[PDB]
Ligand binder design. Structure first.
Ligand SMILES: Nc1ccccc1C(=O)OP(=O)(O)OC[C@H]1O[C@@H](n2cnc3c(N)ncnc32)[C@H](O)[C@@H]1O
Length: 516
């Protein structure tokens, strides 16, 4: 669909309210502590919207939302959006200085926070002159007491479809950049990918390990399913415990499962993976980083369920290149999504020849107009009708897009560019490797060479044979210049809360260690 198909004045609360009153009694969200129907969610959201008015919240103002994946997260979100205020979904695993930057940068007058993050804000309270009211979920306004006297009716704000309704802070190399999205972006992404590509329907039930502050989870596990009347499952617990994730799948029986390759690998690493009932699943989705072909087969062979890998970014809200239930090429990002126009260019802007590595330029109506409080980086990223994602890609002879890696993660060995994704995808083929990361590192002649940081399967330790096996595997599958000069075994890798690997930290630690 197009933006022109939408009414000129649109509010993203319609994502929820397009289901009323027909699906008023259908359970909309499933949480271990709570289950709500579409009517109950709408009622509580209207109470939130009314309660925010009592705190003086107005159209165009940012409201802080820092809590676990829960019913209170959703009702707060739609309460803010319906009011015409700007919802700020904040990362749950940050530091107090990181929270201080965010809240000051968006001038949040009101913060909705869970009690377990309360002291993390309490120590930065003085440095937030605009923050007046802190509502606590779990000296302050408690969530339930705060929405109790408020009526369950509310009129949606007369928001333009291009007006900002949300602000997502994407972690940088930094710090984080504020990414504002308009009301129009929500039904657009829900239609362009959620329906047209993934094939979400009313009978479906979504469950994403990705959190609601991550737009991968925001769309896939809330905006997209509710757009078609489907239900969603919210997991408030720590994502690191893969066993509890599989049990949630067994208990609540979702039909769609979202995760990152690092999450799929962690699940398959479990010795008792098959002991969980995953039969309700009809489709799985992977994103955040490129899903290795070895992981796609390992999951397909253990579950029978296809995984849909697709690349998205917070600047575009969601996926712009994806695979399809009828068309999957394991290891690739699939085909261009209809409505999104792609382009691969060199480092000077010229369209590369077919098959060669180029920079990704995205043409989208769901893309943000600019960053929040980053003038320089906005003009570097948002190039008119084209969006620079900072990714290197190349196209198959069959038209399939393969992620070479982040432009920063690319390493140059002997003048030739080496893709970390390809090398990592080869390493993970070995059954002893759970996951890995490949960076560039000077070789005491200061010639950059590939170094592989490898996490082994649980309880497995390196051996003289294992190194040899991995070495011989890289000789058979990759060209000599792409082979890892060093192989270092680790028990953990620097990760973001969005299921990414912070290779810039490995690149920092390796450069530091090389100088010793
Ligand atoms: N916001 C999202 C919504 C939906 C799906 C992902 C996201 C998302 O992660 O948004 P972010 O702002 O955190 O970062 C985007 C960057 O992550 C990388 N990436 C994401 N998905 C893939 C993939 N399937 N294959 C290869 N690389 C991928 C890519 O470099 C991109 O530039």
């Amino acid at each position: 669909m197009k933006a022109s198909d939408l009414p000129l004045y649109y509010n993203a609360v319609d994502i929820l309210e397009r289901n009323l009153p027909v699906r008023a009694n259908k359970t909309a969200l499933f949480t271990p502590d709570r289950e709500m129907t579409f009517r109950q969610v709408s009622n509580e959201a209207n109470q939130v919207g009314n309660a925010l008015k009592g705190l003086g919240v107005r159209f165009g103002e940012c409201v802080g939302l820092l809590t676990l994946d829960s019913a209170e997260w959703v009702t707060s979100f739609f309460g803010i959006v319906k009011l015409g205020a700007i919802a700020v979904g904040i990362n749950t695993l940050l530091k107090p200085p990181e929270y201080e930057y965010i809240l000051r940068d968006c001038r949040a007058r009101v913060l909705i926070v869970h009690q377990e993050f309360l002291p993390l804000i309490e120590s930065i309270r003085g440095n937030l002159p605009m923050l007046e009211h802190i509502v606590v979920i779990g000296g302050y306004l408690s969530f339930n007491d705060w929405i109790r006297p408020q009526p369950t009716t509310l009129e949606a704000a007369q928001s333009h479809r291009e007006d900002i309704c949300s602000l997502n802070y994407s972690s940088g190399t930094g710090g984080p950049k504020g990414i504002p999205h308009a009301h129009k972006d929500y039904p657009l992404t829900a239609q362009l990918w959620g329906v047209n590509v993934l094939g979400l329907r009313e009978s479906d039930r979504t469950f994403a390990l990705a959190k609601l502050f991550f737009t991968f989870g925001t769309g896939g596990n809330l905006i997209f399913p509710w757009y078609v009347g489907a239900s969603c499952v919210l997991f408030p617990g720590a994502a690191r415990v893969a066993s509890n994730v599989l049990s949630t799948i067994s208990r609540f029986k979702p039909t769609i499962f979202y995760n990152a390759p690092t999450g799929y690998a962690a699940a398959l690493a479990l010795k008792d993976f098959s002991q969980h009932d995953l039969s309700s699943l009809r489709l799985c989705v992977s994103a955040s980083e490129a899903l290795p072909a070895a992981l796609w087969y390992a999951w397909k062979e253990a579950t029978g369920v296809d995984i849909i890998d697709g690349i998205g970014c917070t600047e575009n809200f969601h996926i712009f290149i994806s695979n399809r239930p009828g068309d999957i090429r394991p290891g690739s990002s699939g085909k261009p999504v209809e409505g999104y126009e792609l382009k691969l260019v060199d480092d000077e802007g010229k369209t590369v020849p077919a098959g060669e590595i180029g920079n990704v330029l995205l043409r989208s109506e769901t893309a943000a107009l600019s960053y929040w409080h980053n003038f320089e980086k906005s003009r570097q990223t948002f190039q008119g009708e084209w969006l620079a994602t900072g990714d290197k890609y190349f196209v198959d002879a069959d038209g399939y897009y393969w992620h070479a890696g982040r432009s920063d993660d690319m390493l140059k060995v002997g003048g030739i560019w080496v893709s970390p994704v390809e090398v990592e995808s080869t390493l993970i083929q070995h059954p002893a490797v759970q996951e890995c990361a490949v960076i560039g590192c000077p070789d005491q002649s200061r010639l950059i060479k590939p170094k592989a940081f490898i996490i082994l399967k649980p309880e497995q330790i390196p051996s003289e044979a294992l190194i040899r096996q991995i070495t011989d595997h890289c000789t058979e599958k990759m060209a000599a210049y792409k082979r890892p000069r060093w192989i270092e075994f680790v028990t953990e890798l620097p990760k973001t809360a969005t299921g990414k690997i912070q290779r810039f930290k490995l690149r920092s630690a390796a450069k530091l260690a090389a100088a010793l």
